[PDB]
Symmetry: D2
């Protein structure tokens, strides 16, 4: 299960432990269709969040550094990001689409904005290459690369922390770029834990976008 985000990014499900019933078993501390869902909604509405910590996901994410920086602020989770000492490195950059600027009356055509960004990216990247070729270590030369450079990471997180992530990132107040990733995370969450996801939207979700999309 993979979802493409932005121009070159993505969110892919690597593994998952449990499902809605994992939270049910944990809540009852042990080991009926309607009875189980009722328990899930009960836990959600009353704020009994601990049982959902027993559902865990591992995602593989490709996102721009500025998005990853905001993402990594979520401390109750595990991350492993690219370094280039265990796997090969790649150089791609997030170039906003003209549509991304819709809504703002910019004196510069949204098409020209996309071009200027692409322009600087190319120049920074070429400078980077020029430095490496001259013998400058990568850890130094890389500092000239822009924040829109794509990176990749593995993210393992339990359902409770995931719902906190959605509360903050699947919201109109969050930067549009991370909103997109949050939407993809929500879709995968819904596919693996439909009962929990539904209960979440109904009683605990604090954001807005998940109720519109």
């Amino acid at each position: 299960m993979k979802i493409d985000i932005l121009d070159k990014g993505f969110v892919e499900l690597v593994d998952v432990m449990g499902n809605d019933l994992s939270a049910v078993r944990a809540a009852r501390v042990s080991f009926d269709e309607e009875r189980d869902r009722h328990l899930i909604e009960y836990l959600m509405k009353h704020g009994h969040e601990t049982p959902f910590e027993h559902i865990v996901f591992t995602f593989h994410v490709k996102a721009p550094i500025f998005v990853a920086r905001q993402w990594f602020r979520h401390r109750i989770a595990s991350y492993n990001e690219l370094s280039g000492r265990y796997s090969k490195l790649s150089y791609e950059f997030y170039i906003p689409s003209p549509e991304r600027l819709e809504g703002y009356k910019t004196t510069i055509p949204p098409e020209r904005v996309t071009e200027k960004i692409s322009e600087i990216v190319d120049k920074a990247y070429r400078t980077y290459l020029e430095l490496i070729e001259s013998g400058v270590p990568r850890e130094v030369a890389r500092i000239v690369l822009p924040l829109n450079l794509y990176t990749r990471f593995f993210w393992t997180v339990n359902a409770r922390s995931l719902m906190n992530f959605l509360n903050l990132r699947a919201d109109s107040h969050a930067q549009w770029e991370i909103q997109q990733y949050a939407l993809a995370i929500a879709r995968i969450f819904k596919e693996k834990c439909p009962w929990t996801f539904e209960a979440f939207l109904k009683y605990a979700y604090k954001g807005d976008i998940l109720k519109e999309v």
Copy 2:
């Protein structure tokens, strides 16, 4: 996969996410070679790169005396769900004479076991009586002894589990929790043999897991 511990306790595996390769994939940040994969596991363990092992997760169902659970619950990097004494088998851990078969006492070890059993029976009886009288469970239960068995679900990742083993699968820890740590270690070994072996070889700070098999 369930292992009996003490007189009425146990450690049961409920679920597990991943295996040794999960840490390998995480370290390389790649989703998609035994010799080299096992070498990487040893390398990570040897140089202290522990984050990759956080991508292996276990969920256990444990039945242990409260005095043991209190020590267990001090391990904060994990998730717990315990039986609610306020809302809810009423069983207790009675040490066998063999548990004292090592200290010099003024009374036979068997006598100690009898004394413990006796007071537990009296406390339990008092509890049931209070409950019969309409006294709320949350109040009546305060007379129950620390050897009362409780149960909880424990979800923990491999890195945190290894920290648990470093501290509890050791002769300095109380004998009772050592027994549970041994069972946790056995299940860990079965599901992640490569990580477990690398752990014992490069990072394990305790003593018993290098003396006792599986």
Copy 3:
């Protein structure tokens, strides 16, 4: 500041880092009505991170059944007396007859208080017989009841402290820990008045702190 709780317990403030302004500085990231205005803004908009920069260290004496509920709050630091090696005062929480006010019981409340006291006496006396006989404390103490008082140090930041209050300073929590939560709230209010008020007005999810003064 030492506040007495229950019959022999207490909550004592050991140390504190910062005040309301610590959160303001953190939110602004730079080392008054406008400042207080900011605190309220943060609280109403859900900006909780700035309050993580205010930290408290408390010394608490409480019955084990209360401590176990307390220790479920993982985002904090704890150091408690050792049941295996620490010297204890051997004091127990005996509910007052008023504790059962409201519950229709077969026997009178004073009777319940009496029975609890009797079982505690028997358990304690049995414990004494074991220790005097040579039984190690780590084993002998398992017969002691859950109402035995213990002590611990608790270091926690304001954000986690507020989460603790949301859960324990509430009618759904056991009356005994509610009492401790009230004391914690009292100390929080004295050191961080602006944050405390903003909390009650915008984020507090409990009920008792909106009716019980300070």
Copy 4:
């Protein structure tokens, strides 16, 4: 607090506040409310046997100004609290490595020219940023063209135990030189405020080498 240490060309690590000192760990370990000799002995005992929880009762709050590539590595330390400047909503300064930063590395061009080339691309990226902002482009979008050597600022509250883990990982020759410099500043302040704990740390638990 008040302590401040300059790092790199425009960065710094400033001590904002501190709760406790070495005695805070001693009291927590004994879980109560002796003498200097026995107390320092207890600190070494704790450090030696890995009884690290008592040190969680010592807390620091730092104000740090560092380039984003350094901050990114720093923020991987989850057991701590952070508050950083929002790029979405500064004085825009950048870390320009000194020619000496390339000592030991045989480069095709003079080290001075490398510093120049870095300064040049940074200038072009910044000027592009300003042009986008002036045209009405949202800051959150325009800022993505800025380089990783852009300076940011943040408050960091962390306890002594977590700080020691931070030092074991960053105060090491295997860490990038830039973060090593910051780790040395953190260690310096730690030493100043908790002499006993720091000394014990260096003697029995520190796994790095530069300290």
